[PDB]
Structure formats: structure tokens, C-alpha cells
């Protein structure tokens, strides 16, 4: 768990935005202590109006494309895993499904040549993912299983670094913001992303005090 | 039970208005001891002319709308639960009826898709509520069952924080005001409301001494 | 017997909801002392309008399915015990009927291969259960014996953690709530469930004071 | 006599199951004091619905097989003692009948080579056992003497560790369970068995409170 | 929170006006302690007749113009985002709507080419802003939604540095002035503005003592 | 028993993955203490959703092939031990059956020339292995004895380094993961394997915190 203390905007105490190291596949937790800034502003503390933004400062575009499939409940799904690796050069394709990042409500039998069968778990209808690795390069395959009636919609293909939709909170009693920071298994080591956090305090009549800071998430491998 | 002692207006002993923590769904009790202020004013003590006012200092507008239905006595009532959640984004709707806040004189069978049947209890005609939770966000559905003749009127859709119409009292013998403070199940944690209390003492000829104070009700979750 | 004291809602004295350890198969007893909250509210104490709700915070879906059978009075019942274990992988099936959780008004002779004979006790018509263990994983088989005339209805397949329908009580004389907490033999160790209790006090004119708390039931093995 | 106090399920005070040392041939007595658990549950104390189960955690399969014979009343019985020791290797067979574990209503004259004559006691018809030791390894021979009319049935070949069918009792006046624990003379030193006890208390209306614990019986030699 | 102590005008203890660092988008709080000047003037302390003035000492004129639109309640509003960037040179226009400074009661879907749709939030009539960034340079777009009857007036296009209309106060009990200092998201880093504060004390007959000071607000980026 | 403490992901304190020495034939135990990482994440501790993966970083392909045979219950089984050693060069074949790794429910009489007789233990039907050593190089022979009816399936030929299917556990009370690490007798000294462990903590609402680490298992001989 990371713990940061914010700069208190007094006119007093290498880059601008502080650093967060991350490993592909992890889901860590970050705590930010606004006490130094929001305590002198004697009021009602923090509020749940935080806003986050992720932007890449170094990306290294991915090699293998992601893909989306669709199936009804109970019916076995097939698909290919070879049109997802447009290769520039000449080489062979060691298709691989890592057991750490396999599916969640199904099973996949990787074939001999870029083929795989996803038998969805019986009595289940939702969305399911798994992360393949075509020759070292990792991507994800997203399958949505329908409840036999119409058709399911299409989920947004998880990004390398993300901040879960609603797992954030603030205790106005001690001025501490908690949020989760998850790294996809397809994040390439060496990249750098930037997270900007806009947090509002509140004065005792309910007006607003805004505070902005950033963090530099550097995707490392091996910790 | 909260117990507050009022400031005695002598010229002597972070915000202005003191604090009251509240949890969604509770109904607590508050006691205020005017002894320090109204005892030196040797007279006939307090009177039952208290006035309350609720105002929000932080609200976080609700996501799901509330709704009103109507039915005659004995006839089963249907309705929908999907036009009450205008969603900005793309997501699914896990309609839920909490058993803690179910109906009071009926039964509701939540369907598969935002549908529900409220069979009113036999030999009963009044108003009945229940609190649904469309994907975490809570609202209320109000149904009024008519005694088969004309039509019932329309109740005012309980607010997040309220002070029951008539459950207040004052013992002029010890200068203590009692009132109840109820929090709706739809109050969003982190909000802050402000309650202003205007209490009149009385002098021994029947003239008036007014006293005003506030309390800051901060809707917390988990106590 | 667990004994909890409730927080008195004064504005004064790791998770939110306190903890209850449980062992699969037990049936324990819990006592909650509302004295700290309901005594200052000088009135008629607690009432028998408690409401409970169980929700899982970690479930670990079961491997072996449960099953339901039916038989008339006196006639011996057969059934299979092999279509209740859809296995992903390749392995053998050591069908087992634990003597601690055998039937109650019958006898079962487990066969060599997933077969069993439930001879219902003579002159008896009701419902009867027993808990099998197909290769470590436990489920229940429910049989209903009919009184030879029509057909019996179908009971609801006991859940991992439950609170018996009517074994709850409150002594308004000392503000203490008693209830029973039972754990099915199929509860998987390591899971966590959450119990929410909504208890109403009453004021001396019969109005209501609601109080809500939770408890985190963590299914442990070996105590 | 062993005396155990049970853990009271309060959320308070190397393996899970406590230990019982046992010596081959003994028959000891065990007392369990449920006072710490069943006294707060003010009710009608314990009931005589205890259930036991024995399972091996280490067995060391026996070398010499057991055997069953049959004879009518008064007629002398012969048998062999050499087809009961399938030996892997080459060695000689020192057949021995220990005087501590001889027969009970007969006499046996061990021959020179694995032969023996069991002359049943005159005017007696029942079942009779004796424990031989073919080269250190112990087994039992069971003979049933018939009352000259038909044929006697076949008894179940006593296990290494057992809990006698009906010698158990509970005093609801002090919450103490008594049971007997017997070890066969053929139990191999160093083994470990596990005994699980399921004891029910009862509430004052007759409902049930279940309690489960285990004990690890470690077959030692020499105490 | 900034805290300044004023010079006491005794004839005793690089630029003239002290310094305040500011970051684009923030809203901070400033406290000025007139105790050193207004305490010797034994009287009735400070009064709420403070006057502020903002003047730029370095501005760096903006590149992209701001804009104003108008719409009635409920009707979706369109507009362009390309006539707001008169470019001197040849380059492309990466239109961007930052999520930190998006709208407040609507939603905007930025198109492919400088187009955007602002669907106002249902049941809402007021003014709404959002800050776009045409190729690094930031400006604001102001939309006013009318309550279907006539037409709304036109708000004054928030300046880079401002002092909120009425959030200022003075405690005559300790001679401390509080005011808020907000920085627009379009303030260009490196600029310098000057704030002049004219504060009046009061003598015990109600006459006046004026005091003037300045502060140099230097718009920095990254704190 | 190995004991590792995990790195706590704070941004603070030759290869990446730590080291585990192993000896062919052993079965050791490993303990990992997640306290440093999962304790600050005040929640419900670890869960039983660990995932392991073994991959070789140096293998040294085996010389002698493994083999599979089949027999019914009670019938003696023959087989050869010479087509399992395709030799490149010219040399003789000192067939050997180590007594440390002999069979478990049978006996094998190694012949003069690569022949052997496996007489299965009477009254036994399962799978049985033994490890031969054709001229220093070790492999395994797997025999499955059928219960005379149909045919048994075919077990998966144990790998050099493995992690037993279900002998893993986690005590959420002290944040410690236990698992077993077994090394086959055919592991070649000097090889290196890599074990990756993916462990999930859980927050107090039941969401997830993932943690990944590796260990480098270096097959040594003589400790």
C-alpha cells in the first residue's frame, strides 16, 4: 500500500509529480493524506467528488491486437488466435494461455495452431476474459455469453493502467483518500503513465476548495 | 441518544453549529438541555413553540428517481422499475429490493427485469412504501391503496433527513427539549445537512424569549 | 454464546461490522445488549420487530450440486449420486455419507458406485435430508416422503449461513436480543458473510426508534 | 481418565484437535465438560444425542489377516493359523497366543505348526475371540458357537480404535459427557486416529444447539 | 492555506508586495492577521468593508478565444470548436475536453473534427461551463440553458485569477481576514498578477482607519 | 521449511525472484508471510484463491523415457525395461530399481535383462509407480490395476517439480500462506525452475487486491 502526503500550499515545504512503481497484473492500494492542506481550512473536511485522469507519457504501442467474441448461454464457443498478431518479420507463433490470467467462468483448450475452445460454465451469462501471449506479446480476448434471449452489449477493453470505477473513498474525520490502482497484464515494462487527482475540500457553509496533484506510474517488471 | 447543552448567552463559555452523526435508515433521539439559558430567566420555563428547519450544505444529487403509483383496495398492482434509472453511461441494472426496507402492508415479488408485483394486504387501505436499489443507488416507490370509492391523495416523498411532524416535547420542569431525528435509507454517505432550532422560553407574564442554534448532521455510513 | 454490546449513538465510544467466527455444522447462540442505546430513550424498551439479512462478501462457489427427490410413505427410494459432481478435470469420485450428518428418519446404504437406498422410517411422512461428500466437496440431498395421498411441496435447500425462522426474542426488561446462528455443513472454510440486524425500540406512546448494525461471519474450519 | 474442557465459542480463549494417548489393549474413560459452552445458553442442558466418528490419519496396514470360524455347541473346533500370514519375504512363523488376550469361554492348545484346537466351554453358545501373534504381527480369530439348532450370524471384526456402542452418558446437571475409548490389541504403535464428537444442547423450548470438536488419538506403545 | 501577517505601521519592522504561488485550477484559502496593526488602535476591530483589485503585471495573451452559447431547457445543443483558434502558422488541431474540467450539469461528446454535443441534464436550467484545450491552449465555453420561457442573460467569462464575490469574512475578536483565491484552468504558467487589499478598522466611535497592502500572485505550474 | 517475507509494495525495501534449493526425491514445505503487504490494507486478509505456475529456465532433457502399463486386479503384470533407453552411443545397460523409490502396493523382481514382474498386492485396485535407473538416468514406470470390470484411465506422469493439487492454505488471522513443494526423483541436478504465485487479498466489501511474486527452484544434488 502506497501512502502519500500532499503538499500543503503554504509557500513552503526530480520531476513534478511523485512516483508509483507498478507490476503487470497487480492490483494495489493507494492512500493520500490531505491533512496538511485541508486541516487549516477548518470546515467539513473532504468530500466524495474526486476526479482521476490517466495519460501516457511513454506507451510502446502493443504488437498483438485484442479481440471480442460472442456466444449464447451454454453453447460452446470457438475462435482463432492468429489474425491477432500482424507480424512485420518472419517468425513462428508460440500461442500461449497463461494459467495466472486464464478465464473466470469457463475453460479454454488451446489447440495446436492458434485455435481454442471456450466452453462457458454451465448456468452462467455474463462477460469473461482471458489473456493470451502470442510470442511474448500479451493481449486479451473478451467473450460475452448471452442469456439466450437477445444479445449482450460490448465491454470497453480494459486499459493498461486503470483506477476502478467505484472503490474510492474519503474519511472526512482524518482527511485521507483511498483508491485502488490496477495494472493490466498487458502493460509493457518500462512505460510511464500519469495520474492526475482533483480533490475538493469544503468550507463550513458548503463552498469548495480544489486541490490538484499528479503521480507518475512507471510500469516495471519484477516489482 | 444525543444530549446537547445549549450555550447560555452570558458573554462567556471548529464550526459554529455542533455535530450529529447519522446512519442511513436509523431513527435516533436528541435531547437539548436549555437549563443554562432559561433557568436564570426565572419564569415559566420552555413552551411548545419550537420550530425546525433542514437545509443541505452538501447533497450529492440522487441518481435514481422516485416514483408514485396508485391502486384500489384488494386489487393487485403492477409497475416497472427501469424508467427510474436514467443512466449516463453503459451498464447493467441489478434491480434489488432490500428486505430491511421492504413494504409494510403488502408483498413485492421482484421480477427478472425491473418488474414487480405489489399485492396489497387484504382488508387494508392506506399508503405503503418500499425502497429499491437499482445498482447500488437507492430510491423509494410510494403506493397508495384506495378504499374502493374515490381516489387517495399523494404523500410528499420523504426527504433524506427529517424531523417527525409531532414527536417533540419540552418538560418546563427541567428545561429539556426532546425531538426525534430520522434518516431516510436513501441518504448518501458523506453529505452534510444543517438543522436550525428556534426555541421560545416565556416570562412570568407570558412574554417571549427566543433562542436559536444549529446542528450539523453529517450522513455517515457504518455508524 | 457470543455477546455483543451495541454502540450507543452518542457521538462517542479494523472493519465497520464486528466479527463472528463459525464452524461448519455448528448451531450457536448470539446475544446483543441494546441497553446502552435504548435505556436513555426512556420508554417501553425493545419490540419483536427485528429484521435480519444475510449477504456474502466471499462465497467460493460450490463444486457439487444439491438434489431433490420424492417418495411416498413406506416405499423405498433410490437415487444416484454421480450427476451431482460435474468435474472439470480427470479424477475419481470417493462418494461418502458422513455419519455426523446422516439422515434423521431413515437409513442410507451407500453403494459401490454413486448409488444409495433411502428406506424411510416406517410410519413417517415429512422431509428428510442428508449431506454427502463427493471427493471432499459437500452438498445435500433432500427427500420428501408423502402421506400416500397427493404429493408434498418442495423445501428451499438450506443456505450456508442462516438465522432460524423463529427462535429470536427480546426481553424489554433488560434490553437484550437473542437469536440463533446456524452454519450448514456445506459452508466452505475461509468464506465471509455479512449479517445486518435492524432493531426497533419504542417510545412510551408507541412510536419507533430504529437501530442498524452488522456482523461479519467468517466461516472458519476447526473452531 | 482423560478430562477435557471444550472451547466456549465466545470469540476468545499445535494442531486443531487435542490429543489422546492410547496403548494397545487398554480401555480407558474420557470426560468432556461442556459447561463453558452450554451454561450461558440457559436451557435444559445437554441431551443424549451425541454422535461419534473415527477416521484414520495414519494406519500402517496390517500384515496378518483376521479370520472367522463357526461351530455348534459342545463340539470341538479346529482351524489353521498359517493362511492368515501372506508373507512377502522368506522367514519362519513363530505362532503365538498371548495369555493376556486369550479366549473368554473356551481354551486353545496351540500346536507345533499353525494349528490350534478351541474346545468351547460346556453349556455355552455365543461368540468368542482370541488374539494371535504370527511373528510379532497381531490379528484376531473370531469363533461363533451355535445353540445346535440353526446357525449364528457373523460379528463385525473389532476395529483398532472404537467407542463402545452404548456406554455414553451426559449429566445435564453439570454439563459433562462421559464415554469410553477402547483400543484393540492389534493397533500398531505410532498410528494416529481422529475422533469427532457432535453434541447437542437444547433450549428451554426444546430446539437445538450443535457443537463439534475432534480429538487425535495417537496409538503409542508403553503408555 | 496561506497565512500573512501585516506590517504594523510603527516606523519599524525583494519586491514591495509579498508573494503567493498558484496552480491553474486550484481554489485555495488566504488568511491575513491584522492584529499587529489594529490591536493598538483599541476600538471595535475590523469591519466587513474590504475591497480587492486584481491587475496583471505579466499576462501572455491567450491563443484560443472563449465562446458563449445558448439553449432552452431539455433541448440538445450543438456547437463548433474550430473558429475559436485563429492560428498564425500551419498545424493541426487536437481538440480535447479534459475530464477534470468537464461540464457540471450536462455531458459533451467531442466529435472527430471540432464538434461537440452538450446534452443538458434533464430538469435543469442555469449556466454551465467546460474547458476545452485546442492544441495545448485552454479556453472555456459557456452555455446557458433557459427555462423554456424567455431567454437567460450572459455571464461574465471568468478571469484567470479571481476573488470570489462573497466568501470573505473578518473576526473582529482576533483581527483576522479570510478570503478565497481561485485560479482559472486557463491561467498560463509564468504570469504574475497583483492583488491589492484595502481593509478598514474602526474606532470606538465608529470612525475609520484604512490599511492597504498588495500580494503578487505568480501563476506556477506544478505547485 | 522455507520461510519467505513478501515485499510490501511501498516504493521502498542478484536476480528478481528469490531462491529455493531442492533435492531430488524430497517433499518440503514453504511458508510465505504476506503480513507486510496485506496488513495495511485493513480488510478481511487473504483468501484461498492462490494460483501457481511452474516453468523451466534450464531443463536438460531426460535420457530415458517413461512408460505406462495396465493390468487387472490380482493378475501378475510383466513388462520390459529396454525400449525406454534409446542410446546414442555404444554401452551396456545396468538396469536398477532403487529401494528408496520402489513400488507402493506391489513388488518388482528385476530380471537379468531389462525384465521385471510387478505382482500387485492382493485385494488392491488403483495406480502404482516405481522409479527405475537405466545406467544412472532415472525415469518412472506407471502401472494401473483395474477392479476387474472395465479399464482404468491414465494418470499424468508426475513432473520434475510440482506443487501438490490441494495441500495449500492461508490463515487470514496472521497473513501466512502455506504450500508444499515436491521434487520428483527424476529431476536432474543443476536445473532451475521458476514458480510464480498469484495471491489475492480482499477488502472489507469483498473486492480484490492481487499480488504476484516468483521463486527460483534450483535442483541441487546433496542438499
Residue numbers in the entry:
A (entry chain 2), B (entry chain Y), C (entry chain m), D (entry chain l), E (entry chain n), F (entry chain 1): 1 to 13, 21 to 230
Article passage:
The 15-fold, 12-fold and 3-fold symmetrized maps of the neck were used to build atomic models of the collar, portal, and neck devoid of capsid (portal + neck 1 + neck 2 + tail terminator + collar), respectively. The Milano collar is made up of four rings of gp13 pentadecamers (15 × gp13). The gp13 subunit contains two β-strand-rich jellyroll-like domains. Domain 1 (residues 1–69, 167–230) forms the wall of the collar, and we thus named it the wall domain (W domain), whereas domain 2 (residues 70–166) decorates the collar wall, and we named it the decorating domain (D domain). DALI search results suggest that the D domain of gp13 is structurally similar to glycan-interacting and cell surface binding proteins. Four collar rings are stacked and stabilized by complementary electrostatic charges on the interacting surfaces of their W domains. The W domain of each gp13 protomer is covalently linked to its neighboring subunits by four disulfide bonds, one with each neighbor within the same ring (Cys23-Cys229) and one with each neighbor along the left-handed 12-start helices (Cys22-Cys211). The collar of Milano is structurally distinct from that of T4 and XM1 bacteriophage. In contrast, the Milano collar consists of four rings (4 x gp13) surrounding the whole neck and displaying no fibers or spike-like structures. An elaborate network of disulfide bonds in the collar suggests that they play a role in the overall robustness of Milano particles against mechanical stress, supported by the observation that this stability is lost under reducing conditions.
